[PDB]
Amino acid sequence: TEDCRKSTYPPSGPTYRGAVPWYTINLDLPPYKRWHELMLDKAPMLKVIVNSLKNMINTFVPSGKVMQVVDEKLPGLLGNFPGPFEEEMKGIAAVTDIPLGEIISFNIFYELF
Amino acid sequence: TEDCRKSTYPPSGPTYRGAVPWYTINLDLPPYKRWHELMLDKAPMLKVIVNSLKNMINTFVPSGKVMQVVDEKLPGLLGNFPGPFEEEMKGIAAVTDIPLGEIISFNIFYELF
Amino acid sequence: CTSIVAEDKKGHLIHGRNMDFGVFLGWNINNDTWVITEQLKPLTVNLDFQRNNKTVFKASSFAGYVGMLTGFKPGLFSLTLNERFSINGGYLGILEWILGKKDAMWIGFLTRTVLENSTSYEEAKNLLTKTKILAPAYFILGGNQSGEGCVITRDRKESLDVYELDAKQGRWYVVQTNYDRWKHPFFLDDRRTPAKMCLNRTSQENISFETMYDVLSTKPVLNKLTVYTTLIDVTKGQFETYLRDCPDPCIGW
Amino acid sequence: CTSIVAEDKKGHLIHGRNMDFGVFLGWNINNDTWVITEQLKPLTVNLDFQRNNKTVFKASSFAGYVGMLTGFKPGLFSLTLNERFSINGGYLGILEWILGKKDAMWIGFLTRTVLENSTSYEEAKNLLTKTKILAPAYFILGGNQSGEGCVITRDRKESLDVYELDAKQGRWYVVQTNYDRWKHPFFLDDRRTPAKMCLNRTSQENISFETMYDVLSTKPVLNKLTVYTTLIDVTKGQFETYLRDCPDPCIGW
Ligand SMILES: *[C@@H]1O[C@H](CO)[C@@H](O[C@@H]2O[C@H](CO)[C@@H](O[C@@H]3O[C@H](CO)[C@@H](O)[C@H](O)[C@@H]3O)[C@H](O)[C@H]2NC(C)=O)[C@H](O)[C@H]1NC(C)=O
Ligand SMILES: *[C@@H]1O[C@H](CO)[C@@H](O[C@@H]2O[C@H](CO)[C@@H](O[C@@H]3O[C@H](CO)[C@@H](O)[C@H](O)[C@@H]3O)[C@H](O)[C@H]2NC(C)=O)[C@H](O)[C@H]1NC(C)=O
Ligand SMILES: *[C@@H]1O[C@H](CO)[C@@H](O)[C@H](O)[C@H]1NC(C)=O
Ligand SMILES: *[C@@H]1O[C@H](CO)[C@@H](O)[C@H](O)[C@H]1NC(C)=O
Ligand SMILES: *[C@@H]1O[C@H](CO)[C@@H](O)[C@H](O)[C@H]1NC(C)=O
Ligand SMILES: *[C@@H]1O[C@H](CO)[C@@H](O)[C@H](O)[C@H]1NC(C)=O
Ligand SMILES: *[C@@H]1O[C@H](CO)[C@@H](O)[C@H](O)[C@H]1NC(C)=O
């Protein structure tokens, strides 16, 4: 361990990468449309994770064959989620051009660990 | 499974081997003497279990060398138990001619499983 | 093993339990029995613990075993102990004990300490819930009044759940076998579900020593490992234990 | 992850947490970072969920993740989620889900449902304690009054423990990392013990956004897996999240 840190707030220095931007989600919109604005800005970065996930999967098993199964088989296998999650995730998949099975896997990663 | 059984009490029939005898333990006696009377009556049967344990132990490892360790090393390894148990078990070991390590092993079988 | 604390319409408490134990040494293929189970029967005894010529508590125990697995304190409470299995619970506690950490109690001794020196249902309940123990266990406790019944699922250093009678809500009994109530059983034996089925069929009005013994005589609640059956009534002060047999056809455990 | 609910002498509540996540994809030997952790930083966003131009709740989340791991409902309560590991918890729940048993909620969605539709500290506490979930978890909840803080150690179908603030006992904070309080940590990191040491040195009188951020900036409480740090005050309505870095020398987790 280390001696308890002193005088680190407000955040500055090498342990403060930067501030977090604010976004507004309007629940009055239908679930399919709530995340449209935010996902437009962040679709590229989320694809970086997917590509990075494919490369590591490639070692144990070819990534293509795995993702065909995830994208094609997982949505029907898990069934529908309660609202607004099914439509909220369906909307995120359409806007980001990321398959629904990968959007789902992202949103249930805790259960997957 | 089976239909819930009716008219089984008072106990009789093939599922009732017999009644359980009563013994009185007088806590006013020192712990070392409390089980003297009962252990005199039941020492032979308790030896039957130990003998049966030696036979089964013999399979994995020779029972003799195993029991030397239990009798010689286990009491010192575990240390003393809080009263009245240490003296209660010491008395049971003396009356039954069963080593203390085996009496202890019997009395902590739950933790041992 | 099975432990049941039941409440009749009159709020009267009955505490019954089946003592199942003895697979360790194997199976007698000659008469279809467990070696230890048959050897534990002639060792089973009823014990009247007295101080100054007056009964303190009564118990069912195996001669040579100074801890208490089944007992009651006349007019006060009744306690039975059921085995709880964990990934590595029992042996970590012994390890810390050998290496010098002795602030935890052995399970057989704790229940003995409670039956001997506890004077109330809450005192036992409070001690059974909080005391550090070297291995996980189930404590089934009944009192001298209506509603005083609970199952204490224990970890070595924590009480994961205390399941209490709620006759208003419709919980007139609590049943405990050898698996956590909120989980699932390891095998088919599943003595808990049939125990509840028979407790249900009897209905709260008819729960008694006769109907309780009926529940504990139904397979698989009765099985080849069943050494003895105990029936307890705290307010009446009656405590009786009967050796059992499960002749073929029956089930192993 | 580390979650802390603290209470100053004036009864004011401070809720801080460190979001640690990202070993799954491995380690960047080029700049000593976890692959996912660095990729999660530019995805981190603060979210103002509004209904009729009125803020319902605010959260810190990863863009594309519709469940909530860090958030609060201004003036009502604050909720953070810590990962809890079990032998076979996560997948047994998913399995029953696939076979059609859908009476359990996904962890990310439950915390979202609570932050979105719960109107009080007790309602959230009651739901977080009782609701069936597909995987084990820790829930750290803070309220809008003094003494309203608890850690809910959850099983899929049971609440194993609810650990609450006790100004009487001297418990002005509750800390939760990634191992059950009554057990032991898996590794050396043991971020819980340093958090308590630093929380203790701060003392109840001086706990604030500034000193809370000091605790969450001390190694190993701050570590390479730390994506962001969050500081929350329910009554004031202040909610701040900062991306973090742990430059060498530091620790993996
Ligand atoms: C250690 O090195 C890795 C790469 O070797 C760094 O990861 C990179 O982090 C940056 C942001 O910090 C990512 O940039 C992003 O690019 C996307 C488009 O590609 C853009 O949409 C985002 O807004 C952002 O600019 C970059 O993708 C990411 N690379 C990988 C492979 O994950 C990491 O940050 C380095 N860490 C340190 C402490 O130096
Ligand atoms: C099935 O067969 C086994 C033997 O093959 C039986 O085990 C025996 O059971 C009897 C009574 O249950 C035990 O009797 C005891 O003998 C000792 C001396 O050996 C004596 O000191 C005691 O007072 C008592 O009379 C006997 O020890 C025991 N034998 C062994 C090896 O354990 C078993 O009872 C049979 N079960 C059924 C249901 O037929
Ligand atoms: C019961 O009474 C006292 C402790 O209060 C002590 O003398 C005695 O040993 C106790 N018995 C047990 C079994 O702890
Ligand atoms: C019942 O037990 C309580 C303690 O829980 C005791 O105070 C009371 O005297 C007992 N009453 C009867 C009738 O046994
Ligand atoms: C027993 O009856 C109760 C009714 O209160 C019911 O909920 C439960 O499922 C029943 N259990 C069995 C095993 O019949
Ligand atoms: C919140 O509002 C109602 C339930 O009262 C329901 O229509 C809606 O789906 C709820 N939202 C969530 C996330 O459960
Ligand atoms: C706190 O929660 C209670 C819940 O009943 C609510 O009435 C109150 O407005 C909230 N705010 C404050 C400042 O107490």
Numbering used by the authors:
A (entry chain A), B (entry chain C): 28 to 140
C (entry chain D), D (entry chain B): 143 to 395
Question: How is this structure described in the published paper?
Answer:
A third structure is of the heterodimeric activated state from human, which was allowed to fully autocleave before crystallization. The overall structure of the enzyme does not change significantly after autocleavage (1.1 Å r.m.s.d.), but there are conformational changes at the junction between the α- and β-subunits. First, residues 141 and 142 at the C terminus of the newly created α-subunit become disordered. Second, the last turn of the C-terminal helix-α5 of the α-subunit (residues 135 to 140) bends “away” from the enzyme by roughly 60°. The channel is composed of a constellation of mainly hydrophobic residues, presumably to accommodate the ceramide acyl chains, while directing the scissile amide bond towards the active site. In addition to uncovering the substrate-binding site upon autocleavage, the concomitant conformational change to the α-β junction causes strand-β3 containing Cys 143 to shift. This moves Cys 143 away from Arg 159 breaking their putative hydrogen bond, suggesting that for substrate cleavage Arg 159 may not act as the general base. The tightly bound water, W1, from the proenzyme is no longer present, as it would clash with Cys 143 and presumably is no longer required because the active site is now accessible to the outside environment. The active structure of human-aCDase allowed us to map these mutations to rationalize their potential effects.
Acid ceramidase (aCDase; ASAH1) is the best studied member of the family and is prominent for its involvement in Farber disease (FD), a genetic disorder in humans. aCDase is ubiquitously expressed and found in the lysosome where it normally regulates sphingolipid metabolism through intralysosomal membrane turnover. Similar to other Ntn-hydrolases, aCDase is synthesized as an inactive proenzyme that requires proteolysis for activation. The α-subunit consists of a globular helical domain formed by five α-helices preceded by a 36-residue linker region, whereas the β-subunit contains two central anti-parallel β-sheets flanked on either side by a total of six α-helices.
